[PDB]
């Protein structure tokens, strides 16, 4: 931004999207650190994800906005177009790995449940980050070696090599997304089955108590006991509310994880479908429209990196109360 030579000033109004992308994720990072009730494997995963998304807003988004200002004619030195692209390939990938891990271990938690949690979480964070780095690192070598895989028509900074686009999309989007979807569906199936036994019998006995009838209560508690000693006596508050609250908290967490995964794939599918379709027909297609659509779908995918904190705010008292108190107390 010299600013001499700019071409699209209203694009500066995208800074708001950037400002919230960092801060919201910061609010997650401030939360999972300063709130003791957020110290666990999944919330540490979410802190890592917030770091990745804040870095998206800090490094991937601002260069894209600067390029938009100059009408997609790379305004920075030529050695920064590869880096930026690779940084994209890094941070976004981490996200789709983190979610894929969050849905995977969860499934591996439900199947065969049986170091410490706060350390195996570190191991998984390291694994997903290393995968992201391994995907990102080749891009600068390819770009700085052959500047035609990262520059299109000598001015536009987009990934150009077809084989790399396809292979990276299949190994960084389609495989992680597929694992995420399959694991989440199997998880949400098994959870319903395990919960079903207790909730059906409990509903039977609760309805029979609601009448006053009483003869229809004993077998319900028998079946619930079979599925510990809170039902053998039968009072309703303690053991019922204890085990029933544990099930429902899990249901809420499953809803949140599904919403995060689903916002992610909904917001990133347009860009990926459009790109792999722009290469499915290297000719015979209208490439101008493909590029113009991709220039907006890329930012939809970017904006996905600032929505998960709002999901936490909408479905967590801890995160919401954190965010409010952090905003007012710190400044
Ligand atoms: C040399 C090979 C191994 C690595 O080469 C690769 C090629 C493509 C991909 C798929 N990833 C993307 O298409 N992204 C990042 C992304 C990453 C992960 C996601 F889950 C979503 C998007 C877009 C995002 C928008 N940027 C402007 C350009 C882009 C970088 C290309 C990954 C690796």
Curated annotation (Swiss-Prot):
Motif: DRY motif; annotated at 105-107
Briefly state the modifications made to the protein after translation.
N-glycosylated.
Q: Where is this motif: NPxxY motif?
A: 308-312
Q: Where are the transmembrane segments?
A: 10-34, 41-65, 83-105, 118-139, 164-186, 256-280, 292-314
Q: Which residues lie on this side of the membrane: Cytoplasmic?
A: 35-40, 106-117
- Disulfide bridge map: 81-157, 281-285
Is Transmembrane helix a UniProt keyword of this protein?
yes
Q: What keywords were assigned to this record?
A: Behavior, Cell membrane, Disulfide bond, G-protein coupled receptor, Glycoprotein, Membrane, Receptor, Signal, Transducer, Transmembrane, Transmembrane helix
Q: Provide a Gene Ontology MF annotation, just one.
A: G protein-coupled serotonin receptor activity
Q: Which domain of life is it from?
A: Eukaryota
What name appears for this protein in its UniProt entry? 5-hydroxytryptamine receptor 2C
Organism in which the protein naturally occurs: Homo sapiens (Human)
Species lineage: Eukaryota, Metazoa, Chordata, Craniata, Vertebrata
Gene (UniProt): HTR2C
């Amino acid at each position: 931004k010299f600013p001499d030579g700019v071409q699209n000033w209203p694009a500066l109004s995208i800074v708001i999207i950037i400002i919230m992308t960092i801060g919201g994720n910061i609010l997650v990072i401030m939360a999972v650190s300063m709130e003791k009730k957020l110290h666990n494997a999944t919330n540490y995963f979410l802190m890592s994800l917030a770091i990745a998304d804040m870095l998206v807003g800090l490094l991937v988004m601002p260069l894209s906005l600067l390029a938009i200002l100059y009408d997609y004619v790379w305004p920075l030195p030529r050695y920064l177009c590869p880096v930026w692209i690779s940084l994209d390939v890094l941070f976004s990938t981490a996200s789709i790995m983190h979610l894929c891990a969050i849905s995977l271990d969860r499934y591996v938690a439900i199947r065969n449940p049986i170091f410490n949690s706060r350390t195996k979480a570190i191991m998984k964070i390291a694994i997903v980050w290393a995968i992201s780095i391994g995907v990102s690192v080749p891009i600068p070598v390819i770009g700085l070696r052959d500047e035609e895989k990262v520059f299109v028509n000598n001015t536009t900074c987009v990934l150009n090599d077809p084989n790399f686009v396809l292979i990276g999309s299949f190994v960084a989007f389609f495989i992680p997304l597929t694992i995420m979807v399959i694991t989440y569906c199997l998880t949400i199936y098994v959870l319903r089955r395990q919960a079903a036994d207790l909730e059906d019998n409990w509903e039977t006995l609760n309805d029979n108590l609601k009448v006053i009838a009483l003869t229809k209560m004993r077998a319900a508690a028998l079946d619930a006991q079979k599925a510990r000693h809170g039902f053998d006596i039968l009072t309703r508050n303690a053991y019922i509310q204890k085990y029933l609250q544990a099930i429902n908290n899990e249901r809420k967490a499953s809803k949140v994880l599904g919403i995060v995964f689903f916002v992610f794939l909904i917001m990133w599918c347009p860009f990926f479908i459009t790109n792999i379709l722009s290469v499915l027909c290297e000719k015979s297609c209208n490439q101008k429209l493909m590029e113009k659509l991709l220039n907006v779908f890329v930012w939809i995918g970017y904006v996905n990196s600032g929505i998960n904190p709002l999901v936490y705010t909408l479905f967590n008292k801890i995160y919401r109360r954190a965010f409010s108190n952090y905003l007012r107390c710190n400044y």
